[PDB]
């Protein structure tokens, strides 16, 4: 059947596209003490497991396509989902937009695995200290709220502060013109929909989306001072479907702006 031949073609194409393997992080007592290393090791293990599962499933599909392997119930269900264009349930272990088809999912998985491979290489080259200074895309991670919590824990442990007394400040600056302080963590890929951010100041704009060059998350002691009238709280959704709420950022609107207009127009930060 021609469907079998074209499924062979697309399976081979994806097996070429997806990276080969992922390297687990090396455990160490000092690394175990570090929370960022723990979070990144969990992410690496999850990514490696999912990558191995997907690669083995694609290899089994290819072997069936040659006729060398018979379609078991799991393999038959996978083939049916592939032909119908629906995302297999086994593959989807992280949160994914509902309408995303298989090809886009494979592309996203490839990008995430590339990011994880770079992260593992950087960690192996240095350690947790280098792991602190890695600019990581929140959308690329499987659980970005875990990353936010990990940064909070790292800042609390470095300065011997308590977790509940720390608050988050966002500094949106260019990647080249950025300062990596002790409490500052870089994040890329955030996109602002409904507004433009210049000099950490929000301005209303008609553009559909303005890409934030580099967002610096800084954990600071609770000043216990009321937020100014120009301070606006913007949600950070994981994808464009706006079903996942990672956290909330606080920005300073420009003068002559109205925060109610910001609320009405649905201005929000998106991970991807």
């Amino acid at each position: 059947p021609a469907w079998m031949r074209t499924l062979h073609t697309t399976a081979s194409n994806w097996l070429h596209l997806i990276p080969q393997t992922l390297s687990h992080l090396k455990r160490t007592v000092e690394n175990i003490k570090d929370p960022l290393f723990r979070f990144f090791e969990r992410e690496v293990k999850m990514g490696a497991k999912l990558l191995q599962d997907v690669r083995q499933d694609l290899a089994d599909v290819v072997q069936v396509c040659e006729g060398k392997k018979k379609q078991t119930n799991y393999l038959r269900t996978l083939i049916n989902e592939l032909v119908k264009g629906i995302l297999p349930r086994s593959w989807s272990h992280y949160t994914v937009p509902a309408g995303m088809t298989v090809i886009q999912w494979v592309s996203d998985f490839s990008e995430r695995i590339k990011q994880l491979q770079n992260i593992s290489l950087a960690a192996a080259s240095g350690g947790a200290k280098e792991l602190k200074n890695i600019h990581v895309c929140l959308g690329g991670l499987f659980v970005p709220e875990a990353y936010i919590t990990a940064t909070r824990q790292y800042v609390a442990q470095a300065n011997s502060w308590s977790l509940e007394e720390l608050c988050l400040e966002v500094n949106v600056t260019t990647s080249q013109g950025a300062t990596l302080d002790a409490c500052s963590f870089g994040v890329t890929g955030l996109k602002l929909q409904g507004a433009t951010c210049n000099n950490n100041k929000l301005s209303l704009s008609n553009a559909i989306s303005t890409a934030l060059p580099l967002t610096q998350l800084r954990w600071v002691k609770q000043t216990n001072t009321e937020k100014k009238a120009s301070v606006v709280t913007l949600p950070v959704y994981l994808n464009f479907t706006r079903a996942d709420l990672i956290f909330t950022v606080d920005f300073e609107i420009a003068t002559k702006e109205d925060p109610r207009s910001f609320y009405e127009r649905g201005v929000a930060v998106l991970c991807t």
Binding site: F240, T241, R242, A243, Y263, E264, A268
Partner: protein, 143 residues
């Protein structure tokens, strides 16, 4: 059969659905309130079509919620204005309407905190004594 899109069409359907006698009661201001309610309802429903942007999910802001809001307005206006032909716009129980239509009606389906914030913004913009002036703007810089 589908409802014709358009704030004008939505308001016309809302006004046709409500009996004419109810909107014309002892307080002459009551009709004004109803109009505002209709407008607000229309706006809310017309933000459903832009689901990712206007809201976070396709809520069921159906006719039942509109009927509940009309009943709430009726009861609170009757309690505040006990058979008075005219009532001052300040004396209108604005806070009761805003709170009830932010938490009980139109807010029971709202689970996202930011959707609740948007609903509160809309209610505080529309339902106020300042609406009873001829300078009130139902919308700003439309075109």
């Amino acid at each position: 059969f589908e409802p014709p899109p358009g704030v004008k069409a939505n308001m016309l359907r809302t006004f046709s659905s409500i009996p004419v006698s109810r909107i014309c009661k002892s307080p002459n201001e009551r009709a004004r309130l109803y109009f505002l309610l209709a407008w607000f309802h229309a706006i809310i429903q017309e933000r459903l079509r832009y689901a990712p942007l206007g809201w976070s999910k396709k809520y069921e802001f159906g006719e039942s919620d509109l009927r509940s809001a009309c009943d709430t307005v009726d009861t609170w206006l009757d309690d505040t204005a006990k058979g008075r032909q005219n009532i001052s716009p300040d004396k209108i129980p604005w806070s009761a309407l805003k709170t009830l239509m932010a938490q009980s009606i139109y807010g029971g389906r709202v689970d996202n905190e930011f959707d609740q914030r948007l609903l509160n913004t809309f209610l505080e913009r529309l339902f106020t004594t300042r609406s009873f002036d001829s300078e009130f703007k139902l919308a700003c810089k439309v075109d």
